[PDB]
Amino acid sequence: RGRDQFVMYRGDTVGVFWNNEKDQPENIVDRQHWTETFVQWSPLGTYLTSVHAQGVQLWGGASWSRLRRFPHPFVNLVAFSPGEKYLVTWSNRPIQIPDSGHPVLTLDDDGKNYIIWDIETARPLRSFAQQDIFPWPVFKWSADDKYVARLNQGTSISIYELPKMNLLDKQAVKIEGVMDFEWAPATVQREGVKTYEQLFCFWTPEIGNNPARVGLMSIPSKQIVRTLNLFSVSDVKMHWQSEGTYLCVKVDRHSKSKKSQATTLEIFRVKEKGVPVEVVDTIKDTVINFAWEPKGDRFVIITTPEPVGATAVPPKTSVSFFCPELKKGNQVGSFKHLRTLEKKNHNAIYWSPKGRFVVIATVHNTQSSDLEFWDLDFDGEKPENEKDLAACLQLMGTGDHYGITDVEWDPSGRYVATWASAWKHTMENGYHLYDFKGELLREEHIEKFKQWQWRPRPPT
């Protein structure tokens, strides 16, 4: 059938189900109190993760039997390395080790919040305490599970090499003023580089007589392969493309008056010689959403103007598409504005994992629930003003879901699930099942629907 599994957690019961489109989901399993607080899928779909006060547990196999156990007390957040080789557990409450003894941890782990585990052996590799002075993950992974890093804001970036979890060159990367950083989501083959490397971007604000900058570092050489100096900058956001082909930096800027001014989008061509940087566009309003097309070269933003009165009426939002120009040959033209939609309340972007199709949504709002299903490679005639661009934008269908909180695409990019979680509000928990086109296949009301989550499937 080529169906996909998914999990739903309602009340105190969680179950793995087959997908039957409009027909009722076939149930592989259902259990009561499988988890205490939440349920999370392993990124390659191998494990189902349950969380308890004592520990976090990994369920899997045809039997759906226990596979691994990680005795971290009172975990709130859990993350995996991209290749499922390692596990990261976090607790807001610092670990308290009993004098009686802990079956795995020791006094060295007391007062700490993070633990990094080796899944295969279930043994803890390192323990870390909370930083001096919400976001997740904090420990960020390289694409190949070889490096994991944490930001020491204003000072350095501590990079560790696995499986030993040893500090690289017995030193943290000194970067004065470093505000944030992101690894590339893939192992990038830059042109002409024969050596192994992993890439991450970072940024610093203005320091003394040096301007604010965005950097691109190669690990483990720790060489900076490209710097980009920026001016009049309020804040910087760094957005990697899925293959690591492109890196877009969003820059919040200001006037000499230091009033809010404009936002600039600039793009790195990471694979190309010299690492060229291009100035895409400068936009007046603030950006509240940004999303690259997975495995593609298209991205969407959602903007909203600045409020002066903090007025009762919600701000309307504008969604804009950007795509590269058509270019003769196996190359990609310069990034250009494609189209801006009419003002509306949208505030969420959900690209398909395949990346042709994107769902523009309106979630966590009481005034509107609208859903839009768009195609970027529609078999149609491009309008005159958008004719040179490498895209054919077309609305494939609309939909709605009252009190919607979340949406998730299926791995195959054929189905879109939306749901109202009990975690945010209890008024009308439900899940909708759509296809890519936006046709409502089925919906269902569950009294205490906590979460839907597709089971990830890596391409064979």
Element (H, E) at 240: strand 233-240
**Closest distance to Cl ion from the beta carbon of 139 (Å):** 22
**Closest distance to Cl ion from the beta carbon of 351 (Å):** 9
- Residue 250 identity: K
What DSSP string runs through 253-281? EE-TT-SEEEEEEEEEETTSTT--EEEEE
Closest to Cl ion by CB, 3 or 271: 3
439 within 8 A of 417, measured Cβ to Cβ: no
Long-range contacts of 244-248 (CB under 8 A, 24+ apart): 244/143, 244/184, 244/185, 244/186, 244/187, 244/188, 244/199, 244/270, 244/271, 245/188, 245/269, 245/270, 245/271, 245/297, 246/270, 246/292, 246/297, 247/184, 247/201, 247/216, 248/280, 248/290, 248/292, 248/299
Closest to Cl ion by CB, 11 or 458: 458
Task: From 81-89, 172-180, 288-296, 422-430, give the range in contact with Cl ion by CB under 5 A.
Answer: 288-296
In whole angstroms, give the CA distance from residue 241 to residue 185.
8
Closest to Cl ion by CB, 162 or 228: 228
Closest to Cl ion by CB, 87 or 319: 319
372 within 8 A of 346, measured Cβ to Cβ: yes
Closest to Cl ion by CB, 250 or 346: 250
Q: Would you count residue 126 as binding Cl ion (CB under 5 A)?
A: no
Closest to Cl ion by CB, 333 or 456: 456
Site residues for Cl ion, window 348-407 (CB under 5 A)?
A: 349
In whole angstroms, give the CA distance from residue 224 to residue 20.
50
The residue within the footprint of Cl ion, chosen from 13, 37, 153, 289 (CB under 5 A), is 289
**Closest distance to Cl ion from the beta carbon of 288 (Å):** 7
Task: From 3-11, 47-55, 261-269, 356-364, give the range in contact with Cl ion by CB under 5 A.
Answer: 3-11
What DSSP string runs through 165-194? TEEGGGS-EE-TT--EEEE-SS----TT--
Closest to Cl ion by CB, 94 or 413: 413
Closest to Cl ion by CB, 160 or 321: 321
Q: How many residues are listed for the chain in this entry? A: 460
**Closest distance to Cl ion from the beta carbon of 411 (Å):** 5
**Closest distance to Cl ion from the beta carbon of 59 (Å):** 20
Element (H, E) at 335: strand 335-340
Closest to Cl ion by CB, 1 or 256: 1
Task: With H, G, I as helix, E, B as strand and everything else as coil, classify residue 308.
Answer: coil
Task: From 63-71, 175-183, 282-290, 414-422, give the range in contact with Cl ion by CB under 5 A.
Answer: 282-290
Site residues for Cl ion, window 250-279 (CB under 5 A)?
A: 250
Task: With H, G, I as helix, E, B as strand and everything else as coil, classify residue 109.
Answer: helix
Task: From 55-63, 147-155, 374-382, 452-460, give the range in contact with Cl ion by CB under 5 A.
Answer: 452-460
The residue within the footprint of Cl ion, chosen from 290, 315, 339, 354 (CB under 5 A), is 290
Task: From 9-17, 58-66, 230-238, 442-450, give the range in contact with Cl ion by CB under 5 A.
Answer: 230-238
The residue within the footprint of Cl ion, chosen from 1, 194, 256, 258 (CB under 5 A), is 1
The residue within the footprint of Cl ion, chosen from 104, 122, 291, 440 (CB under 5 A), is 291
Q: How many residues bind Cl ion (CB under 5 A)?
A: 10
**Closest distance to Cl ion from the beta carbon of 315 (Å):** 16
Closest to Cl ion by CB, 38 or 292: 292
Closest to Cl ion by CB, 287 or 332: 287
Contacts with Cl ion, 233-252, as mask; x by CB under 5 A? ----x------------x--
In whole angstroms, give the CA distance from residue 219 to residue 238.
18
The residue within the footprint of Cl ion, chosen from 3, 85, 253, 336 (CB under 5 A), is 3
- Give the CA count within 13 Å in the CB-facing half-sphere of 44: 11
Q: Would you count residue 20 as binding Cl ion (CB under 5 A)?
A: no
What DSSP string runs through 210-222? B-EEEEEEEETTT
Q: Which class for 352: exposed (0-12), middle (13-18), buried (19 or more C-beta within 10 A)?
A: buried
Residues found near Cl ion in the complex (CB under 5 A): 1, 3, 237, 250, 287, 289-291, 349, 459
